[PDB]
Every structure is written in structure tokens, then in C-alpha cells.
Amino acid sequence: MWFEVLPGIAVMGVCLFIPGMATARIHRFSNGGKEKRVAHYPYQWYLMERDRRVSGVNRSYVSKGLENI
Amino acid sequence: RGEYVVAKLDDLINWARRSSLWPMTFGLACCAVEMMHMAAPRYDMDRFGVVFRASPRQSDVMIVAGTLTNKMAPALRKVYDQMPEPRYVVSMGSCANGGGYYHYSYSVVRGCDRIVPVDIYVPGCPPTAEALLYGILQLQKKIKREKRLRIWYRR
Amino acid sequence: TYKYVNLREPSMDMKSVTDRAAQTLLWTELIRGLGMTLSYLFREPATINYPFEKGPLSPRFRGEHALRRYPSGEERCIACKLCEAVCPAQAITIEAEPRADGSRRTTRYDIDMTKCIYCGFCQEACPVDAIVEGPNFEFSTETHEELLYNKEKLLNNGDKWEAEIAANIQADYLYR
Amino acid sequence: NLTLNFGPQHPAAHGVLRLVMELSGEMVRKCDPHIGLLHRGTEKLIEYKTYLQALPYFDRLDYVSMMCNEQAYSLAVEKLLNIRPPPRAQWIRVLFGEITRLLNHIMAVTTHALDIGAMTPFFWMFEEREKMFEFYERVSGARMHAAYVRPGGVHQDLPLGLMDDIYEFSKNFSLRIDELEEMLTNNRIWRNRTVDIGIVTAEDALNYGFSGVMLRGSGIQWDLRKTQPYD
Amino acid sequence: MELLQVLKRGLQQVSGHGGLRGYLRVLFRANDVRVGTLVGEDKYGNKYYEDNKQFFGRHRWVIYTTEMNGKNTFWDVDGSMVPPEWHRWLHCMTDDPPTVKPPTARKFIWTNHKFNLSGTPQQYVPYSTTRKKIQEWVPPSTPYK
Amino acid sequence: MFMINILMLIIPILLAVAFLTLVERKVLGYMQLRKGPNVVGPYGLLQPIADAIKLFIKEPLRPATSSASMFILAPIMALGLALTMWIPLPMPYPLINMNLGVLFMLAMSSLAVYSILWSGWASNSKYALIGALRAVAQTISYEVTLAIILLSVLLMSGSFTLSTLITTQEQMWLILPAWPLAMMWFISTLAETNRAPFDLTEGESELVYAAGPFALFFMAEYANIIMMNIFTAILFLGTSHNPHMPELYTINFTIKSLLLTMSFLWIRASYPRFRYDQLMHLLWKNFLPLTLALCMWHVSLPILTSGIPPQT
Amino acid sequence: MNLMLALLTNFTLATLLVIIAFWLPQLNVYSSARLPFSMKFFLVAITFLLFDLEIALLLPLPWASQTANLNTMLTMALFLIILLAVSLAYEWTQKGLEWTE
Numbered sequence A: 001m002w003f004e005v006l007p008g009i010a011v012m013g014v015c016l017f018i019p020g021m022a023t024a025r026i027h028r029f030s031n032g033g034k035e036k037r038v039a040h041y042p043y044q045w046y047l048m049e050r051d052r053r054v055s056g057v058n059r060s061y062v063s064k065g066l067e068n069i
Numbered sequence B: 001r002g003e004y005v006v007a008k009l010d011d012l013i014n015w016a017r018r019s020s021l022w023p024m025t026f027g028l029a030c031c032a033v034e035m036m037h038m039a040a041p042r043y044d045m046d047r048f049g050v051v052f053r054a055s056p057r058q059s060d061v062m063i064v065a066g067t068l069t070n071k072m073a074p075a076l077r078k079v080y081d082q083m084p085e086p087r088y089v090v091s092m093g094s095c096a097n098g099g100g101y102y103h104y105s106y107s108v109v110r111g112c113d114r115i116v117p118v119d120i121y122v123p124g125c126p127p128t129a130e131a132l133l134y135g136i137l138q139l140q141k142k143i144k145r146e147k148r149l150r151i152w153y154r155r
Numbered sequence C: 001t002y003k004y005v006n007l008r009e010p011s012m013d014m015k016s017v018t019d020r021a022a023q024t025l026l027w028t029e030l031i032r033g034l035g036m037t038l039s040y041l042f043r044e045p046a047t048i049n050y051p052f053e054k055g056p057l058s059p060r061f062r063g064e065h066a067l068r069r070y071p072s073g074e075e076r077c078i079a080c081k082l083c084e085a086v087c088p089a090q091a092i093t094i095e096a097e098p099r100a101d102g103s104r105r106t107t108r109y110d111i112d113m114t115k116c117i118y119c120g121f122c123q124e125a126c127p128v129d130a131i132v133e134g135p136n137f138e139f140s141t142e143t144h145e146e147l148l149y150n151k152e153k154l155l156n157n158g159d160k161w162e163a164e165i166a167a168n169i170q171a172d173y174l175y176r
Numbered sequence D: 001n002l003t004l005n006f007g008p009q010h011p012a013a014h015g016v017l018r019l020v021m022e023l024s025g026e027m028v029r030k031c032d033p034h035i036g037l038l039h040r041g042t043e044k045l046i047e048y049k050t051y052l053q054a055l056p057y058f059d060r061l062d063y064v065s066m067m068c069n070e071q072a073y074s075l076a077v078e079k080l081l082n083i084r085p086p087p088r089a090q091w092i093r094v095l096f097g098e099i100t101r102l103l104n105h106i107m108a109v110t111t112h113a114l115d116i117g118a119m120t121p122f123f124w125m126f127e128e129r130e131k132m133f134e135f136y137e138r139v140s141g142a143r144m145h146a147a148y149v150r151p152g153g154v155h156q157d158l159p160l161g162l163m164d165d166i167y168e169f170s171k172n173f174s175l176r177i178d179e180l181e182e183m184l185t186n187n188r189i190w191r192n193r194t195v196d197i198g199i200v201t202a203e204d205a206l207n208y209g210f211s212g213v214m215l216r217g218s219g220i221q222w223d224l225r226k227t228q229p230y231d
Numbered sequence E: 001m002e003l004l005q006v007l008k009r010g011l012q013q014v015s016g017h018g019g020l021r022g023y024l025r026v027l028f029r030a031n032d033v034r035v036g037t038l039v040g041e042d043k044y045g046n047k048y049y050e051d052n053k054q055f056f057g058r059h060r061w062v063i064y065t066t067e068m069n070g071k072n073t074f075w076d077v078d079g080s081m082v083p084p085e086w087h088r089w090l091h092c093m094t095d096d097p098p099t100v101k102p103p104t105a106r107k108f109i110w111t112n113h114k115f116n117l118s119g120t121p122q123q124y125v126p127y128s129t130t131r132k133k134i135q136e137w138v139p140p141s142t143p144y145k
Numbered sequence F: 001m002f003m004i005n006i007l008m009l010i011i012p013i014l015l016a017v018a019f020l021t022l023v024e025r026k027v028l029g030y031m032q033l034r035k036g037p038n039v040v041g042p043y044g045l046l047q048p049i050a051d052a053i054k055l056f057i058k059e060p061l062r063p064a065t066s067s068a069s070m071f072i073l074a075p076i077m078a079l080g081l082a083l084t085m086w087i088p089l090p091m092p093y094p095l096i097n098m099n100l101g102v103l104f105m106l107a108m109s110s111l112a113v114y115s116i117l118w119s120g121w122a123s124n125s126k127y128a129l130i131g132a133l134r135a136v137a138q139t140i141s142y143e144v145t146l147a148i149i150l151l152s153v154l155l156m157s158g159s160f161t162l163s164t165l166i167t168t169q170e171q172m173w174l175i176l177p178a179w180p181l182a183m184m185w186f187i188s189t190l191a192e193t194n195r196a197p198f199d200l201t202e203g204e205s206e207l208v209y210a211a212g213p214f215a216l217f218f219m220a221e222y223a224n225i226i227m228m229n230i231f232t233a234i235l236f237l238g239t240s241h242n243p244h245m246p247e248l249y250t251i252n253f254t255i256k257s258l259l260l261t262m263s264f265l266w267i268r269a270s271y272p273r274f275r276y277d278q279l280m281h282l283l284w285k286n287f288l289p290l291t292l293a294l295c296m297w298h299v300s301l302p303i304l305t306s307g308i309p310p311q312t
Numbered sequence G: 001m002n003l004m005l006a007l008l009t010n011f012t013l014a015t016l017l018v019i020i021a022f023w024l025p026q027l028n029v030y031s032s033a034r035l036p037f038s039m040k041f042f043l044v045a046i047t048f049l050l051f052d053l054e055i056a057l058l059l060p061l062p063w064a065s066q067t068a069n070l071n072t073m074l075t076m077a078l079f080l081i082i083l084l085a086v087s088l089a090y091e092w093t094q095k096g097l098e099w100t101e
């Protein structure tokens, strides 16, 4: 019966689901729980390098707020 | 132990090879029609892992389904020689089994086992699609009994 | 009396011409063909679960041969050789002589099951219902020699299958 | 002129038919069928059989139209014997002759579609073929080579309840033809593979010895069931 | 919502086989978890079921025994294991099971059915059943030349 | 941590490819009034594993190769490129976030034709080579429309970044303003990947040569079928992205890809096969004229509607 | 460095799989130069190449639409596509798209 096709479909679904899920979670793990910063242009890259220096730990994802002022 | 290892490796490749038997059919004559009915929805050979249309380059079992004439014998042997191993042959129907109703003819090979080795003989003129399925399932059990690795280990 | 299968005039009014233009560009017949295959995906398949389910057969089915007996256990065959005469394939070979008790009985009764065409002419020709084609069709073998039946093999088939063979003959003999 | 002859300088086996074709690019310039690969000397073997013994050879000719082959041989022998089969036998023979026609046209149409890619009507219709094989098996004990139609009539009478099942099967079969037509008749890809392909004129068909649909396809009004009827 | 009543039918198959182990056992042996009426059981352990709501072909089936004639048939089942008295019923050559219309007993009928024996030590080996036809002359034992 | 990411992309791809074989055989079966695999494992779930093992312990084909190095190269080329096509795909976050991700995929897809060509040279057979050239001619022909169709859609997106297609389709799928292009794009992916009714390499292998691992070429081909359909979903059926619950995107986006892939299955079950010249005419005389006209239309349309997208 | 790693991994695994697909079966021990090929196929390849080159000039169009010189951009964008269409019209009428003969 047609619903016996579903188990194979479900296995494919889980297999395709992992790449998108693994990438999203690894990004959060590596970037202080936030999205990996996108730097497509020199301005975006420049602000990232500035952030790395301002962080004080050499990590561009460690934000520093008004506590530094 | 090494005995127990080869016992399970044998069980593994044997399970894989009989769960994925890909036939190429010489539909030479009548018996090809019953072979088509075994692929047809009622019996659905594909549900056993036996794909319907397989190229000779990827085939594991040859089914001689029909009369093998003298004029065709060289072509049958050619295809058999090109099948990669392991390869098995199922002889289907009286004609292929031993000439059948044209046994005494001048142009008919009296059994395909004169040209190629045969593993299973399916009797009938023609065997019912379910009779051919019985022979295919009997070939699987023949493969299940194989013990290449255990014999290699004991060389 | 006859009919035309493809003698039709396509209308050339703008409505009809636009109907074929929308068909060409929007693939309507192709999508209609997709509907038919979709309706089959949701139909119950016709597959049966062999070997746990079997295709239906009738009492007349022609399968593996067997030599039968009388209720007393005496062989029905009397070495008349009518089966051997009619066999279109010459698959039957018979020899006979007087038995120790004087009965007319066979000393050889072979069927080359790789010559046999399973035509059933032998059971039609037999005057005493001795040779029959039984209901068994699952006797494929691994060697050629296993399919060259002699009298011992054929009698064993009869003893093995008599329960079913008798019931099948009971069902069909009024049509013979 | 590339050539495909299935031999040295061409590693490939032929099969049932050895077609030796010479092509110019994509076009076929000559098509040379080499047959005899299923020649079995049936006509010589029949000379050693009695008329009844030779009957099963005709099941194994057009092995898709078994009972029709039996009928042609039976009519020839009845004509030479100067006898006729009884009316019920003639009606049974026409009934199974038309069932046999369904068996053949299903096979012809669906394998023709399969050979060019449309693989699915073959499965839907071969379930219908399987049911018709049961009618063969119920009257003769054999699914294909019934040997049921014999000179003088038929071998055995229909078992009780067979006609009812044939009625049930026929009642639904036209819807199966409709489903087959829904896949093929109006499909632009099917039409592009068959329209204006293998055109034969009415005169060429006659002089080349064609018959059946090969004649009627070109408009010739001929059918032996009408012009030279039998049974 | 028939979805729920479809699912309930699914669960009743689990209980219809006597728990999950029975449901799994028939799923992996016979690749089918349907529940049918028990029509009978032969002397070898094969169980025969019917379900007349199924389309013709699937309305009768056999769950083979796990051991026949000393052979382990838990996974290795075979169509030839069906004895003749049930063979007629399972192939729809009749309507009546042997539990209702048993076969005619005979002295010579096998009491123990055998499945296909090809490829085993029990396989059939052909031979000529006739005796020697030409007798040779045996020379005398005492010398005399 | 990035290497853990690469393997979490490669390994599931090969598994999804493996179980697409099972899904294809079962969906084709039920459309044909049968079941397909249901014995090898429950519901045939072990069938892909049995087939994989069997192929990999089969004897190699015995015709001698005309080029040893280039016999190895073809499968490596084919499989390596197939895996490479997945690294820029945003699901919703790409493994590699490429500014010109669309161009990268177009460029890599155009190199996958080399495996077809190289396997022809290594075949040591003129018929094998002639077959390889025919497939290449078909492949490159439909690359023409895919590139132009792709360019037309990007004129509503405004960049070559793939994740920008998600922003473009925030309010509405691109299949609505571009359904004429979606129709042609979908058929081109069928003919691009030698899929029925465009599987003529195996259609014309019929009647009336040294060959690499069938398994390696098969896996590459089926990875491309999934990737093509994933790309179709992103390009036309854009999924909304919630940055705080990314897994919601991955569920819906996956389902769209599965359905699109199942439609490839649905389509080989339904139609007969084109003749070679007729699918060449389908491109050069039908798709390409419309694609050129719609490329012109889609250059004009943003300008005349004042709907030009931003660069970033 | 990530793209190099991804590329290196993709082909190393492809290479690894290929070799074991070459040797794993060996764990068992199972016992003149002008191709006869139509000139029409050469023209397909050449036609693809020339259309591929024109497609290269159209690829910058998404960025080109960002200029204040939209009157010139649109004119040249259409000019190129029209000439691309004129080339197809020339091949078509000259029977270059045919396969007969």
C-alpha cells in the first residue's frame, strides 16, 4: 500500500535534513551562539577585523558594549 | 575465532549477493512471456530485489528463456563470457533444459547446458511465472549456501 | 462494416486554435497523463505475497507427472503404451513383461521432463487413469539428471500427491 | 556509411533478431534483417507427427496468440476431413479467439510503448493478461499452450462458472483501454514517435504481401472475419 | 477523520499477533502483518489463514512452520513445504479446507510430506530400472586345453 | 570544527543518494500497480545496503582500457564535482558562503561534462566514444538555456549570492512572476541529467567497452539529481527563514526538495522517450527562442516597473 | 582556506572511494583517426561555444542594472540578446539545426 513508500522517504528526509541542521548549529557553537558573520565586501571585512582587535581576545564574535566606554 | 569471522563475512556477502540478483533475460521464445509475467504486478520480481531490465554488463544471473538454436548458440556463449563474476545461469523451460519439443531437430541445441554451465533448471513448457519465481528463490538459497571465504581460509 | 480511427477535421476558428495553443504551451495533455499515474500510486497494488500466497489454479492444471494406484495399492498402469504412442515429444519410454504373478506391468516407465511439453495428452490417452499431470509446479532442480524421471520417481510422486490428485480428478472427470 | 553487423570490429551480441544496418549520420540507408535465430524446423518435425500430435506445435508459433494458431490448424484439418465442429464448439472458439486477440494486442501495444520508454502501461495491462491466462488455465489446465482447440471442436467443455467470470472481466476492461489511451493517444511525445513513421501505401502493402492491420492502417477495407468468415 | 481509524487498525494488528514480538516476527518472516482467521494447522506446523475482504489472490495465505522434517525453516521457507491436502486449498483449486472435507485415506499415501530435495543428499538420481538383457557365457573353471 | 561540518554534509548526501534508489523503485512500483522492494529489510529498507555491497565486490569489467590514468580520472572527476555542488547551498546557512555562489555552481556544473568525455576516451571503443559525444552534445545544449534562465531570475534577486534568493522570496515564491521560466528550467534539469524522457544514452545503447565503477558513476548522477532539485526549490520555491529557529527552514525546504525529486520519479513513470533529434529540436527551436525572449523581458521588467533589486 | 579544505576533502574521498572500488573486488580471485561521426555534431559544439561566449557578456547584467545610465544599459542589453537571437535565426533558416542527411 502506498504509505509503505514513506519509510524510505522519511530516511531520505532525515539524511537531507542533517546538513542544514548541522551547519546551523556548528555556526552557533563557533560564534558565541550567534550567526556566523557574513563579510562579502571589504567594508564588512574591515569591520570584522576591527571587531577582532576591539574584542581583546582575537575573536571577532566577542562583542564589547558600553562597558568599554 | 577467525573461523567465526569468516562465517559472518560469508553470511554478509552471500546475503548481499542474493538480495541483489540482477538478471539479463535471453527472451528467445515462448518462455520469455512467462518471464514478463513474473515481472508483471502480480508477482513483482522487483520486490525481491531482482531488477527487471538490467544491462548485461551489470548482470548477475542469465536466464535462458526459450529455444536455443544452432544459429544462436555462438551469441549466447558470447554474452555469457562477458558477464562479470559471480554469474549464474537459470535454464527456463523444456527447450532450454534439454531441447524439449524440438529436441530431435537439426537446428536446435539439445539443452543450453551444452553451451554454458547451468545452476537451476526450471521445468515446464513454459513454467508458470510463479514456477519461475520458485526457481529464482531456489537460486537465492543456493547462493546462501556458498562458502567462498571459509574455503579460502582453509587453503 | 468499418469505422475511421483518425479521419477528423480540426476546427480553425479562433477559440479552437487558441485551445491548441494553450495546450502546446501549457502542456495540458502531459499534465493529464500525470494524473493517471498519480491515481495509480494510490490504488492498492495487485502483488501477491509469494510464497505465502499462491496464484489461483483450477483442477485441470497440468503440472508434475505421477503414476497412480487402485484403492488396493495395485498399480493402475498396464503397459498398454498408449501414452508413449501419443506423446508429441517422445518423452515417455516404456518396457514391460509379465510380472511374477502374471500381471501385465511395466519394468521401465521413464519421462524425460526436459523433453516433455506438459501437454497432458498422456493422461487423456490413458485408459485406466494411471498417468496424470498433478498440481505440483514447484520441482525445479539444480542438475539436468534430476529431471529424467524413472518409474520409481513417478510412483513416489503418485504416493506423495494422491490425496490432491484424487480430489482434482473427482472435480473434473465429468467434463471428460 | 557506418555499419552495425554484430561481429568483429563490433563487440555486441544480437539476440532474437540480427539487424545489419548501414547509416549515413542519423539516417538509415539500408536495413537487412538476419533471421533464423529461432528457426527450429517445426515444419519438418510435423511430418513425423500425427495430426493430433502436431497440434501443440501451433501454440508455439505466434506464442502470444496461441488459441488462434490452434484454430487455423483445426480449420485446415476439418476441411480436409470433410467434417464440421458443432455449434457450441464454434462459439467457444470465437469467444477464445477474441480473448486471444486481447492478449495479443495488449502485448503488441504495451511492449511497443515499453521499447520506446513508456514503461508503465505494460504493468497495468499485464495484470489484465494475467487474468486472461486464468481463463486459458481453467478450460485447459495451461496458461499459454492450451492445446484446447482441436480438429473436430474443442477438447473439453467450459467449467461451470467460467462464463460469469469472463463477463466480470469484460465489464471492466474498456476502462483499462481508456487508461491506456489517456497515457498514449494524445501524448505529444507518443505522437512524435509514431506519426508519419513507416508510411506504407495501399499498393505497396498489397504487393509486399502485408495483411491485417498492416493493410487496414493504409485504408484498405479487408478483414477475413468479414470477407472469408469461419466458425 | 478516517486517519485515526486507519491508525487504530494498524495497532490492532500488533495485538492481533500477540504483542510486538509476534508482530515483528511475522513482519520479518513473511513481510506482512495482516491478521486473518485461522483456518487450520497441518501436522508440520504450517498455519493457514483466510481474509475474504482481501482481493482474490491475497485472501488465503500460509505462515510456514519454523521446522519441517528436521530442517530449520525460520528464515528458509519454501513453496514445496505445503502438503497436498492443503495445496489444493491454498491454490484455490477448491473452496473446502481439509479440516472440513478431508482427503480420502489410502494405505499407500505418504504420511510424511517432503519438500523439494534438490541439492541435498536426498536428491533423486536417475537409473535404468530394467535388468540386463544379454547374458554372457561364463568359461569353465576347470582347465582343459 | 569545520572539518566536522564537511563530513556532516558529505556523508548524509551519500546516504540520501543510497535511499533515493529505494524510493525510486517503490514509487515507480506503486504507480505501476505493484510494490517494489519490500523483502530485503522491513519495507525494503535494507535493499540499498545490499545493492551497494554487491556492486563493490563484483568482478571488474574485462575489456581493456585505452588510457589507464584517464580511466581513473573520470569517476573521480564526476563524484568530486557532484559533492562540490553542495558546499554553497544555503540550507539556510551554506557550508561556504560565496559572494558569487550562483556563478560557482554554474561553473562547476559545466565541468561535469568532462567525465562523460573522458570515459569515452578511456573506453577503447569507437561506439563508446560516439555514444559519449552524443551525450555531451545534449548536455552542453541544455546548459545554454539553464544559464540564460538562471540569469533572468537573478535580475529580480540582484546578486549572485544564493542566500539572497531567500531574501528575494520573503513575501512570495519566484515561481509566480517566473512560472514560464520555471517550466523550462525544470525540463532542462531533466534533459541536463539524462533523465526520462531524455535518457537517450541508455535509450540508444540498445540494439536492433572498458567501463569504470558503475557504483561511482551512479552515485554521482543521483547526487546531481537531488542537488538540481534542491537548487530548483531555492530558486523558485523560496522558504522563509527565521534566524532564531533555523531548523524550521531546513524542514520545509527539505520537503520541497523531496517533492521535487519525487516528481522526477513521477515523470519517468509517465512518458515515452524523445528521439535524439527531437530533443535537440525541443531546445534549439522551442526553449531557446522563448528563453531569449523572456531574458529580454526580464531585463526590461525591473526597469519599467521601478522594481530593480539592490546589489547587497 | 575553508574552500580549499572542502574541495580537497570532496576529491580525496572521491579518490579514496575509487581506489577501493578498484581493489576491493580484487580481494576476490575471479579467474584513420577521423571518427565516423557526423559534421552536424561539430556544429552543435561550435554553436554552443559561440552562444556560451555571448552568455558571458550577459552575466554582468544584474550589476549593470544598478547604474544611473539606464537608458544606455537597457539599449545594449537588448542589442546583445537580439543579435544572439539573430544568430539563431540564421542557423535555423540555413538548415543548420536539422539532423536529416
Ligand SMILES: CCCCCCCCCCCCCCCCCC(=O)OC[C@H](COP(=O)(O)OCCN)OC(=O)CCCCCCCCCCCCCCCCC
Binding pocket: C024, C025, C026, C027, C030, C031, D188, F180, F181, F182, F183, F184, F186, F187, F197, F232, F236, F267, F271, F282, F286, F287, F290, F297
Ligand atoms: C504581461 C506580459 C507577460 C509576458 C510573458 C508571458 C509569458 C507567458 C506566456 C507564454 C508561456 C510560455 C510557456 C513556457 C514553457 C515552454 C513551452 C514550450 O516550449 O512548449 C513547446 C514544447 C514543444 O511543443 P510541440 O508539441 O513539440 O510543438 C512545437 C514544436 N514545433 O513543448 C514541450 O516543452 C515538450 C514537453 C516537455 C516536458 C515533458 C515532461 C514534463 C511534462 C510535465 C512537467 C510539468 C511542469 C512542471 C513544472 C515545474 C515547476 C517547478
Ligand SMILES: N=C(N)NC(=N)NCCc1ccc(I)c(Cl)c1
Binding pocket: B051, F018, F020, F021, F022, F024, F025, F048, F049, F051, F052, F055, F215, F218, F219
Ligand atoms: N533504482 C535505480 N535508480 N535503478 C537502479 N540502478 N537500481 C539498482 C539499485 C542501486 C544501484 C546503485 C547503487 I550505489 C545502489 Cl545503493 C542501488
Ligand code: SF4
Binding pocket: B029, B030, B031, B065, B066, B067, B092, B093, B094, B095, B096, B100, B101, B124, B125, B126, D060, D063
Ligand atoms: S519450453 Fe515450451 S514455452 Fe518455452 S520456448 Fe520451448 S516450447 Fe515455448
Ligand code: SF4
Binding pocket: C083, C086, C087, C088, C089, C090, C091, C092, C111, C115, C116, C117, C118, C119, C120, C121, C122, C123, C133
Ligand atoms: S504431457 Fe505431453 S509431452 Fe509430456 S509426457 Fe505427457 S504426452 Fe508427452
Ligand code: SF4
Binding pocket: C076, C077, C078, C079, C080, C081, C082, C083, C084, C094, C125, C126, C127, C128, C129, C130, C131
Ligand atoms: S500409463 Fe496408462 S496409457 Fe501409459 S502404458 Fe500405462 S496404462 Fe497405458
